[PDB]
């Protein structure tokens, strides 16, 4: 049902291509899969071979140096699930040296059960944005995907196939334009799904022929047996791997074959928990007469001999080699050249070791900060030792910060010096623990302590701010001191302060000041006296130059010497978010004032520069500046105030027409501490109608043609009238006017004309105020006798 063809193993494919015939029968590649040395391969040579097989692969797959194969549909669209029980360099997926694959063709693998993906060396690939890795990744290992054409500007992944996208983006998920993304129920696909898009039986992984049918599945996440995907099997069918069980005959036959010396590389298969396995685990050994795992004389594990007296582990591929070891017959070298997510596998696979024959060296720590997988490891035989008699070597340890517990994990170094250089992430306390727990003997070795613990702040002692004082830029703190075994071994205490918006700021690891993006350091000299509360009650320092109303995270740290003893660790203090005292709310900025009517003025300004505490209010005063009266008689012929609280604009109404108005503005953060009155001025709109002459134009018509004109002065002149425009007109002449001066207006109660030509005369009188000015009186008539 699930696997139609033969369950073939994995091999290497190089040079010729005849062997692909056998792959037409291999529905399951039990093991790895490797292809290499494809130079005579044309994009037309693959049209001849395709398979209805390779439904599942138990281990990794390797791609290497192949041409042609523009797509993936030229082979099986199979391999819905890959077990990945073995990884090549931690990769169950390796892509390398591809210069012809233009797109993707397979639409079955929805679960990356194990292994990482290494995609590189591609200059023609597309359709890599249709992956929807969330739906594909059931396990992630920081897959490396660079050096591809789809990484570069390659395509848009177009298909007639919008498919399912659960990402922020939305791509027409389709490996190939023709076939869409393999869609499975988002609620049930790990419990088996179907190509029909329906949830399958919960005994299967991925696609299934029919929904909820173990018989009609495609891949067995649990077990396969009797043409049906199962989870249990009779004793004759001993559980082989976790996708099927195997008959007994297989087990004893392979036991007998591996027993024969012509092939000793394979182990005599035995029955354990009704599961046929190659050999017996640690503590057990082969039972030729029993096909079981019986203790030899109790425990008898694998005495794992290290070739050249040393083993170097760099990848899960290398880590899987020595699993189940307890006895180690060589030294070790460890290096982490990038990559992370490794300690979990170390703990799950190699923690069983408890002794090491040789030395150990560590370089370029880049993925660990602690070690816990070795609690049973308590003795170092020192059989293999480094030059300089080193049983250990520490270098480039820029990531590790913890070695182990000291009660759960003990240590005994039989022989060998120790190297400890360039480990700033590991402090001196841990080195001391090595020395004491390991008893290493205890002979000091050449160790660059100046290069270890540089970034590892392990000042086990503490500092506490005893005295507190502050006045708006001046925080004086006299902390509780720290006294090393000697007051002179003491080298001082470094104060660290920095402004903090809210309480989330923490201490730094430690470095010398070269930039402007770290804590502010202030070192205080070491008190070299015998704790005299007459010369130094509490060592401390008064820092100044700050500004009012500002919070500052602050702490201090001791400076200590490099005592060869396990002592002289140093002390430190805690992050105190000290808010500086508030003073002088500062001056409101840019006062603005504009009049929009005779009794309407709009006012604006800006908030104070340094509002200390909170601006509590604004002190605002003003006063009307009436038009000056000196021009009133010339002929050309307390303070009103308002309160503002946390506001920057104002509107003033009810004022007289024109005239000046100056307004001051000063904020006050406390109610008190005020600011400088920002002065602005504005003039309301003059009323030209209020400037209109009251009183008519009287005509003292006399026989002598002497006409005396009396009129009054405007009701509300903008300022006052400087003169009057008396336009008496002879009908049929050009502009006629009289410049009635203030003196003349007072003299003749306005004006007096003496002598006119025969016929009616009209006169208009217009005032002249400071602003707006008067308006012409209506033309009034007085008939001069003809």
């Amino acid at each position: 049902h699930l696997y139609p063809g033969e369950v073939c193993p994995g091999m290497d494919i190089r040079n010729n291509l005849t062997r692909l015939h056998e792959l037409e029968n291999c529905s399951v590649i039990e093991g790895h899969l490797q292809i290499l040395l494809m130079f005579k391969t044309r994009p037309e040579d693959f049209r001849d071979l395709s398979f209805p097989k390779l439904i599942m692969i138990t281990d990794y797959l390797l791609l290497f140096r192949v041409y042609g194969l523009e797509s993936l549909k030229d082979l099986f669209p199979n391999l819905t699930v890959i077990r990945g029980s073995r990884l090549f360099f931690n990769y169950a997926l390796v892509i390398f040296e591809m210069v012809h694959l233009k797109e993707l063709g397979l639409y079955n693998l929805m679960n990356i059960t194990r292994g990482s993906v290494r995609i590189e060396k591609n200059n023609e690939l597309c359709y890599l944005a249709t992956i929807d890795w969330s739906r594909i990744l059931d396990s992630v290992e920081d897959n490396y995907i660079v050096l591809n054409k789809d990484d570069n500007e390659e395509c848009g992944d177009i298909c007639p196939c919008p498919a399912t996208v659960i990402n922020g983006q939305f791509v027409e998920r389709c490996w190939t334009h023709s076939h869409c993304q393999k869609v499975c129920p988002t609620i049930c696909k790990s419990h088996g799904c179907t190509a029909e898009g329906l949830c399958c039986h919960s005994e299967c992984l991925g696609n299934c022929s029919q929904p909820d049918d173990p018989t009609k599945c495609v891949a067995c996440r649990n077990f396969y047996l009797d043409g049906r995907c199962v989870e249990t099997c009779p004793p004759p069918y001993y559980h082989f791997q976790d996708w099927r069980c195997v008959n007994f005959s297989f087990c004893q036959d392979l036991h007998h074959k591996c027993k024969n010396s012509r092939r000793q590389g394979c182990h005599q298969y035995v029955i354990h928990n009704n599961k046929c396995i190659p050999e017996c685990p640690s503590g057990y050994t082969m039972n030729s007469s029993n096909l079981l795992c019986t203790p030899c004389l109790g425990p008898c594990p694998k005495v794992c001999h290290l070739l050249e007296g040393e083993k170097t582990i760099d990848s899960v591929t290398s880590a899987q080699e020595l699993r189940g070891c307890t006895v180690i017959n060589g030294s070790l070298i460890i290096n982490i050249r990038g990559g992370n997510n490794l300690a979990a596998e170390l703990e799950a696979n190699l923690g069983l070791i408890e002794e090491i024959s040789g030395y150990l060296k560590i370089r370029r720590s880049y993925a660990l900060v602690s070690l816990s997988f070795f609690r049973k490891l308590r003795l170092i035989r020192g059989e293999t030792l480094e030059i300089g008699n080193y049983s250990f070597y520490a270098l480039d340890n820029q990531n590790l910060r913890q070695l182990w517990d000291w009660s759960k994990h003990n240590l005994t170094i039989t022989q060998g010096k120790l190297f400890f250089h360039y480990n700033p992430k590991l402090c001196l306390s841990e080195i001391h623990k090595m020395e004491e727990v390991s008893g290493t003997r205890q002979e000091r070795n050449d160790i660059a302590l100046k290069t270890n613990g540089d970034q590892a702040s392990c000042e086990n002692e503490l500092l506490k701010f005893s005295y507190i004082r502050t006045s708006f830029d001046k925080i004086l703190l006299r902390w509780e001191p720290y006294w090393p075994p000697d007051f002179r071994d003491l080298l001082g205490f470094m104060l660290f302060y920095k402004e903090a918006p809210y309480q989330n700021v923490t201490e730094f690891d430690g470095q010398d000041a070269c930039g402007s993006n770290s804590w502010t350091v202030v070192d205080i000299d070491p008190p070299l006296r015998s704790n005299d509360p007459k010369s130094q009650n509490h060592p401390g320092w008064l820092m100044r130059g700050l500004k009012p109303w500002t919070q500052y995270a602050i702490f201090v740290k001791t400076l200590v010497t490099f005592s060869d003893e396990r002592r002289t660790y140093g002390a430190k203090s805690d992050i105190i978010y000290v808010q500086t005292d508030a003073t002088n709310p500062s001056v409101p900025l840019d006062p603005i004032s504009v009049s929009n009517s005779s009794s309407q003025i709009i006012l604006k300004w800006k908030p104070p520069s340094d509002p200390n505490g909170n601006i509590t209010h604004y002190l605002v005063f003003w006063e009307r500046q009436a038009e000056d009266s000196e021009l009133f008689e010339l002929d050309y012929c307390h303070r009103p105030f308002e309160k503002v609280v946390n506001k920057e604009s104002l509107v003033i109404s009810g004022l007289r027409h024109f005239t000046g108005y100056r307004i001051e503005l000063q904020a006050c953060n406390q109610d008190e501490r005020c600011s400088v009155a920002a002065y602005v001025s504005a003039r309301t709109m003059p009323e030209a109608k209020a400037d209109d002459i009251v009183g008519p134009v009287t005509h003292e018509i006399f026989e002598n043609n002497v006409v005396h004109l009396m009129w009054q002065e405007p009701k509300e002149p903008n300022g006052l009238i400087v003169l009057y425009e008396v336009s008496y007109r002879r009908y049929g002449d050009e502009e006629l006017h009289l410049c009635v001066s203030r003196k003349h207006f007072a003299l003749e109660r306005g004006c007096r004309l003496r002598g006119l030509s025969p016929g009616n005369y009209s006169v208009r009188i217009r005032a002249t105020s400071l602003a707006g000015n008067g308006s012409w009186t209506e033309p009034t008539y007085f008939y001069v006798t003809d």
Partner: peptide, 23 residues
């Protein structure tokens, strides 16, 4: 350096909080 005159007296009054006042 900048604690002079009355400001100096204020500084002396405030700085010694672990001691009394003598200026």
């Amino acid at each position: 350096q900048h604690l002079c005159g009355s400001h100096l007296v204020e500084a002396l009054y405030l700085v010694c909080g672990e001691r009394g006042f003598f200026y």
